[PDB]
Amino acid sequence: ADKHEVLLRMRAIELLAYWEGRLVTTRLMNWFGLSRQQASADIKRYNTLYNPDALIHDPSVKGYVPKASFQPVLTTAHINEYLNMLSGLVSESHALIAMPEPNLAAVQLPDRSVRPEVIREVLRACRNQSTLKMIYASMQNPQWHERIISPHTLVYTGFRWHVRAYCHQSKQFKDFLLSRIDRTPVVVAIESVDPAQDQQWHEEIVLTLIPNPKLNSSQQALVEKDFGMPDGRLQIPVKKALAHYTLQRYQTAITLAEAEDALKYPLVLQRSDIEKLSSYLFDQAS
Amino acid sequence: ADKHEVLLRMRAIELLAYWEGRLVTTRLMNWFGLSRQQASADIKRYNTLYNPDALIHDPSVKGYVPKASFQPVLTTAHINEYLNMLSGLVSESHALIAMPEPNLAAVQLPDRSVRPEVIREVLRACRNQSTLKMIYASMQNPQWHERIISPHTLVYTGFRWHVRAYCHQSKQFKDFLLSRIDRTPVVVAIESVDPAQDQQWHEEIVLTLIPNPKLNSSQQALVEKDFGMPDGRLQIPVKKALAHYTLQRYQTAITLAEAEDALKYPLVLQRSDIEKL
DNA sequence: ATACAGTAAATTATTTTTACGGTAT
DNA sequence: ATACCGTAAAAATAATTTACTGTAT
Ligand SMILES: [Cl-]
Ligand SMILES: [Cl-]
């Protein structure tokens, strides 16, 4: 029942203990502008209400250390949680290389191309299940032209932002890149579409990612370890309309021609799945 | 002079106004566990102490909306700022697809390979400028073997974690994948090497990214708009030891053979720089 | 009718300030 | 003597509770 701010301090305690091996009040002080006394109380609150006696004061290292059986209770055990805490405390989302703390660098992709006036209109249309008229341009049709769309979900792929939307002139659900929308979209009064009919969005498929069959056995074991594969594969369930983005996010080879460079593409989509993958040209708006 | 908690609430007010066009106390209440009265007090504090009169209550849309003259004062106009705020409230870093709120999906890459005990030791060695003995394996030598390293920086490329470190067996600074480090790294008493000698780390270069020249003029203008090019190019200054990771992060073609697929690679490293890498 | 809106006064809870401690090393 | 630690008691600040409000659609 704790407020978000206290929760952030509990998370910070847990992540510092778990990932750095050491926790001192001063770090929480530097992060939250707190007194040593309240930070001490935060540590005690953690150690009694969240992770009972999970931390122990070790005067040898002049700070708190996790107990041998320490197991996080507010975060999952992967390192994204640690980076997320650090970057939320010292954000530099505009920079190419974030340096949230000393000795940590994180490659970023600053997006300055998505305009707020486009976002407010499109997100509101998403929430209202409303229909927009907008000016758009695609690779297939690169001069500005009108589109009539009923959007339902904004999507960040890890590289680009688009909105999943019903295209009324083609009568299909497609992806529209938000950076390609000129001016501000305007609401139009036409019968709206039910997003439940977006087959590709609601149907799932399982992609099987495997080590590049061109690598020798010791090399494939390294790929398995790199991606945490349980049994020589990554089975990835994903919405059909998001499969390609997921594959791109993993840097997977999806054509037999790509997989021939096992150095560039140690991770490959298993061949039987390739003929399953929908056409990518019809993902993008026409 | 405002507390960190208050600053986060001010940030949330600004970002909701700027990116959603509308702000109501109820959202702040759901986000921070506040009473409507305190959230109302936060809105007034923003509108008077941070961005004077930038917001106005519009009863027609049942909330506060930014004024036509609205200008953010606590955030940059990068949509990353909005997504980071949203995701900071609902931590689902484990999911393939995060849904920090309804009508928003975010493709993620959950990392399952980087171990905490490896991080504690290596981070401590970075801060102490100390020297570690560890068990490693690479694609070139995929049998497990010992390596002696002086690390200085952990690196997240957007796809993988590695540590930049002086490699004592090859007397070069190299990148070590953290997923290949066995959980038992050891501090050893060997002179550590000065990270100031990491030539690749401290030298910068300027990469020039351009629309794929195979695209026609109208398509190239779209690439320019997509990537925010001021004058038909993206000039990216970066540490040499991070250049390749940056190019991968942008999904840019870096070989003339890759640049032949203008659909897969609308963005390419300019030819003169390709021979530099 | 709904879902938004203002706030002051009183009560309550959160942090801060102050002081006087203990343990490696 | 550094560098970390506990934490009560008093004081200061922030937040909640209560109780009255108003408006476009
Ligand atoms: Cl650094
Ligand atoms: Cl971009």
Numbering used by the authors:
A (entry chain A): 3 to 288
B (entry chain B): 3 to 279
Please, what does the article write about this entry?
We next co-crystallized BrxR with this palindromic sequence and solved a second structure of BrxR bound to the DNA target at 2.3 Å resolution. The cocrystal structure illustrates that BrxR binds the DNA target through extensive interactions between each subunit's wHTH domain and each corresponding target half-site. The DNA duplex maintains a B-form topology and all the bases are found in Watson-Crick interactions with their partners from the opposing complementary strand. The DNA is bent by ∼10–15° within the plane of the protein–DNA complex, and the minor groove is significantly narrowed across the central five base pair sequence that separates the two related target half-sites. Overlay of the DNA-bound protein structure to the unbound form of BrxR shows a near perfect match in structure, indicating that the unbound form of BrxR is in the proper configuration for binding this sequence. Each protein subunit contributes an interface that buries ∼870 Å2 of surface area, via the formation direct and water-mediated atomic contacts to the DNA (analysis facilitated and visualized with the DNAProDB online tool). BrxR makes relatively few direct contacts to bases in each half-site of the DNA target. One residue in particular (R38) appears to be involved in direct recognition of two consecutive bases in each half-site (G:C and T:A at positions ±6 and 7). K64 also appears to make multiple direct contacts, albeit in the minor groove, contacting bases at position ±10 and 11. Beyond these direct contacts, the substantial bend in the DNA target likely contributes to specificity across the center of the target, by promoting the A:T rich sequence across those basepairs.
